[PDB]
Amino acid sequence: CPLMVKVLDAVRGSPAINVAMHVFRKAADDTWEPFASGKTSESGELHGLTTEEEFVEGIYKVEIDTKSYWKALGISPFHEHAEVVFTANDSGPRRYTIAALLSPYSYSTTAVVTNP
Amino acid sequence: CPLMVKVLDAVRGSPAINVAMHVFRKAADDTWEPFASGKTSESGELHGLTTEEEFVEGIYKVEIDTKSYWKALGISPFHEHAEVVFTANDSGPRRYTIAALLSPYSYSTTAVVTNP
Amino acid sequence: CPLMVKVLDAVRGSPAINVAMHVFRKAADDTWEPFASGKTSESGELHGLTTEEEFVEGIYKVEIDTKSYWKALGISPFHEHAEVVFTANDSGPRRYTIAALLSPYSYSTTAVVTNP
Amino acid sequence: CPLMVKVLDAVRGSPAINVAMHVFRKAADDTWEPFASGKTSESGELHGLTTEEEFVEGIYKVEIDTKSYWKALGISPFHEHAEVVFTANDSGPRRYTIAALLSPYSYSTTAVVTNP
Ligand SMILES: COc1cc(O)cc(/C=C/c2ccc(O)cc2)c1
Ligand SMILES: COc1cc(O)cc(/C=C/c2ccc(O)cc2)c1
Ligand code: NA
Ligand code: NA
Ligand code: NA
Numbered sequence: 192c193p194l195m196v197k198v199l200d201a202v203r204g205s206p207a208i209n210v211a212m213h214v215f216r217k218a219a220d221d222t223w224e225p226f227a228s229g230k231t232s233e234s235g236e237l238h239g240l241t242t243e244e245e246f247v248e249g250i251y252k253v254e255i256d257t258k259s260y261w262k263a264l265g266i267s268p269f270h271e272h273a274e275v276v277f278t279a280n281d282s283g284p285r286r287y288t289i290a291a292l293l294s295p296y297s298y299s300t301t302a303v304v305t306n307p
Numbered sequence: 308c309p310l311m312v313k314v315l316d317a318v319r320g321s322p323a324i325n326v327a328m329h330v331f332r333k334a335a336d337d338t339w340e341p342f343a344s345g346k347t348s349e350s351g352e353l354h355g356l357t358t359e360e361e362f363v364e365g366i367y368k369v370e371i372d373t374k375s376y377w378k379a380l381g382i383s384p385f386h387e388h389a390e391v392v393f394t395a396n397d398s399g400p401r402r403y404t405i406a407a408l409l410s411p412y413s414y415s416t417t418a419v420v421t422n423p
Numbered sequence: 424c425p426l427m428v429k430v431l432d433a434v435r436g437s438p439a440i441n442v443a444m445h446v447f448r449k450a451a452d453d454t455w456e457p458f459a460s461g462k463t464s465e466s467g468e469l470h471g472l473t474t475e476e477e478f479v480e481g482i483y484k485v486e487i488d489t490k491s492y493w494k495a496l497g498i499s500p501f502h503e504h505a506e507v508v509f510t511a512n513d514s515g516p517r518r519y520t521i522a523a524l525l526s527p528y529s530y531s532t533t534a535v536v537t538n539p
Numbered sequence: 540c541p542l543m544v545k546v547l548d549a550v551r552g553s554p555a556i557n558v559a560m561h562v563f564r565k566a567a568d569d570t571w572e573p574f575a576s577g578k579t580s581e582s583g584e585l586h587g588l589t590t591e592e593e594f595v596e597g598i599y600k601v602e603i604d605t606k607s608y609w610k611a612l613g614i615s616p617f618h619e620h621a622e623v624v625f626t627a628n629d630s631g632p633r634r635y636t637i638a639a640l641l642s643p644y645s646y647s648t649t650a651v652v653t654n655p
């Protein structure tokens with residue numbers, strides 16, 4: 192899996208299910224071009240975003256709609272979304288797992304990068 | 308001081324000093340307009356970004372240049388920046404403290420929102 | 424898996440491999456009785472700590488030797504260990520995943536609790 | 540003030556006020572001796588726990604009573620407490636700020652260590 196995103200709920204102690212996100216790749220003119228998208232499964236995971244051959248060097252942005260997640264639970268959260276912006280594949284292919292841990296007024300994110 | 312940002316270094320156990328950041332505000336055409344910028348002090352804090360009169364309702368983005376911070380220490384980090392995007396002052400004026408805790412492959416951010 | 428522990432390295436962007444931990448259960452006299460132990464795999468995970476029938480209500484402590492992990496990388500960390508203390512199984516069996524994200528001067532921990 | 544503790548609430552976006560904590564110091568027989576205790580103020584801070592003369596080299600544990608904090612808000616949290624165990628002052632006197640960011644099923648802790 193070249194790119195996987197895992198989202199956890201720090202309030203309820205559960206995967207964060209049905210969390211929507213879009214992935215963009217920065218174009219030569221500094222605009223954000225659409226690249227991938229999806230929503231998390233019952234395990235809190237989103238797999239299948241891209242393929243190795245399509246996922247080349249670039250600056251990528253994962254924009255996670257955390258606000259909709261909290262609003263569906265009746266909570267007015269702080270953030271509009273959680274963003275993760277990173278250069279990928281600049282030393283050739285790697286496998287990336289982006290994890291996000293969500294609370295209404297806070298998020299934490301980490302990456303695991305593995306060489307195939 | 309209705310907006311303050313504090314940045315901590317989870318590797319060295321210190322404030323994150325001389326970290327640059329830029330603040331943007333979403334315009335009516337949905338573009339990001341420059342709003343303020345600055346660098347953290349020896350305490351890891353950036354004060355004086357705005358004023359009560361200038362800090363109107365809106366969607367704001369703080370982009371913290373974590374990449375330059377790590378690179379100056381000889382570390383090639385994961386993220387291009389740490390981002391915080393939030394609606395401010397929509398129920399009247401509030402004071403916001405944004406805190407960020409930085410590691411090379413992870414960051415955590417929280418907000419403290421107070422009604423004066 | 425009644426109890427699994429997953430450990431991640433926020434500095435290197437990797438699983439934290441070969442991290443040792445012991446699990447204790449609080450006895451009636453408030454002392455900590457040995458309960459389980461192991462070290463993380465190449466995936467950063469420790470499975471097989473207990474079985475459903477052995478893992479009953481109690482206060483459990485997972486004591487993770489983070490200091491040895493950092494010292495092996497030539498780093499003098501802040502914490503002696505990372506501890507996670509929690510009541511488990513007070514409403515009957517659950518499955519617990521404890522995750523820890525490590526930096527030299529910081530750790531973050533979360534739990535995912537699932538009803539079988 | 541060589542030891543200060545600051546506690547933040549990631550759910551409400553506020554300092555964590557009136558949070559109790561106890562500090563222990565490891566004795567020569569490896570038992571935990573009571574060292575100091577207190578409660579956080581309206582700013583989420585606990586100052587005045589110790590003095591330069593009293594805060595000798597040793598292994599210290601801060602146990603923050605997060606369980607009572609969440610229960611008072613009607614939340615049944617995961618952890619019994621948030622724990623920070625560390626060696627202090629082994630290379631001479633330092634000033635320590637321990638920060639903790641709390642959610643019902645997660646906590647994050649960091650240290651800022653300064654040489655006066
Ligand atoms: C005065 O020392 C301070 C002041 C302050 O406003 C915040 C913090 C810590 C914030 C923080 C963020 C994220 C984390 O994961 C863990 C702590 C420490
Ligand atoms: C439960 O299974 C998993 C799989 C995984 O890849 C990561 C995590 C936790 C990530 C995480 C992020 C931020 C934090 O502050 C603390 C943990 C948990
Ligand atoms: Na390259
Ligand atoms: Na309004
Ligand atoms: Na019960």
Ligand code: NA
Nearest residue numbers: 628629630631
């Ligand atoms: Na010494």
